[PDB]
Structures are given as C-alpha cells and as structure tokens.
Amino acid sequence: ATFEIVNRCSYTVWAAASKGDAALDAGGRQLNSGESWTINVEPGTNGGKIWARTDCYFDDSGSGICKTGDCGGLLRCKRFGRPPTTLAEFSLNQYGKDYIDISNIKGFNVPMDFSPTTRGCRGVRCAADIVGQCPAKLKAPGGGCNDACTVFQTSEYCCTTGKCGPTEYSRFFKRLCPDAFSYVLDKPTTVTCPGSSNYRVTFCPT
C-alpha cells in the first residue's frame, strides 16, 4: 500500500513510520513545509503508526534528538516515539479490510488528517488547537499536550486493569477532536476501508 505523507505545516517536521519492532519503509525523513514523502507499506501490516516529530537535531549518522515523538534518537525510526504524538494508526489486509484511525491516547503534537486516496471509505481528522487549549497539567515543555496516562501513570488513566472510564482529561481531547481515540476504552472511531486501499497523511491540514 502507498502512503503519501504531506507536511502542510509552516514548520519542518520529521515524519516517522513504524510498526513498533521495525521501520516502515525508511522509517523517517525530514519534511520541510510543503514537502511530500511517499512510502510503501507491505500488505498485511498490523499495528502500523505514522507520526510527526518536532524540533529535531540530527547529525550525519542520523542520530540526534527531537522534542516530540523521539524514537530512541534515530532519524529512521524502528520503534514508536515518545509522547506527545498525534498518531495515524492502521492495520492492513485484515480479513479483506483495512482499519484506520487517529489517536490522542499518546497525546497530541501536530494536527493531522488521515484520508484514503482510493475509493470506498471516509477519512478522519484532528485539527483543533489542542496545544493552545491544553490543560496546564498536561502541557509538555518541549511542545505538545500529553495524555494523562503519560503524566500521572495511574491505573485509571492508563486503563491497566482493562476497566476504566472517561476522565476530565480524556474529555478535553474528545471535545476538541471527537473523531480521535481519547482513552483506551473510548467508543471506537476506527474506519473500515477496502483491503489494499492507499492513503494520505497530511500534517496541519487546515
């Protein structure tokens, strides 16, 4: 499957793509404002994520640091990134269907649209100014708006027992972005697309 990753933000982002134990495609790249990066993701990929990283410094070897979404100091991510990260999540060719969503479970850094470029399903977006409106206790110094599990590490926020409810913090994310997951047991906002669809992820869609 083809994903085109487009940076419409006015600032540089460093896109990342991983399935947690391996890179997808090259795993990461710098995107200046307006640049597009096209990746190929193997059919059958389960548990893939794409995200943006901000305020990164990398040396010639591709080693460095980012203020949001750092994936162990690497330009080319093999593992998932450090919160806060708005996430585009997908599982492809799962019994004939692809499943896509946007999640705020690991916080929010950059607004995002995640849409098919082929026919037969809808896209999803979270484009509100979550960073500007972020509750004081969830604001990340480096930038972004952390989820409450990251900040407080309680069973209730992290849904450790598999039983948890919405919280004042989850409802903040949900009010601003209803079509994104706000906590682990949120009513699913997953979209079902035809198997082998192609997609575009746009940072700063609006």
UniProtKB/Swiss-Prot annotation:
Primary subcellular site in the record, as a coarse category: cytoplasm
Record keywords: Cytoplasmic vesicle, Disulfide bond, Signal, Taste-modifying protein
InterPro entries named among the record's database cross-references: Osmotin/thaumatin-like_sf, Thaumatin, Thaumatin_CS
GO cellular component: cytoplasmic vesicle
Highest taxon in the source lineage: Eukaryota
Disulfide bonds: C9-C204, C56-C66, C71-C77, C121-C193, C126-C177, C134-C145, C149-C158, C159-C164
CDD domains reported in the protein's UniProt record: TLP-P (cd09217)
UniProt subcellular location: Cytoplasmic vesicle
Membership in a protein family: Belongs to the thaumatin family.
Free-text function comment from the UniProt entry: Taste-modifying protein; intensely sweet-tasting. It is 100000 times sweeter than sucrose on a molar basis.
Descriptive protein name: Thaumatin I
Organism phylogeny: Eukaryota, Viridiplantae, Streptophyta, Embryophyta, Tracheophyta
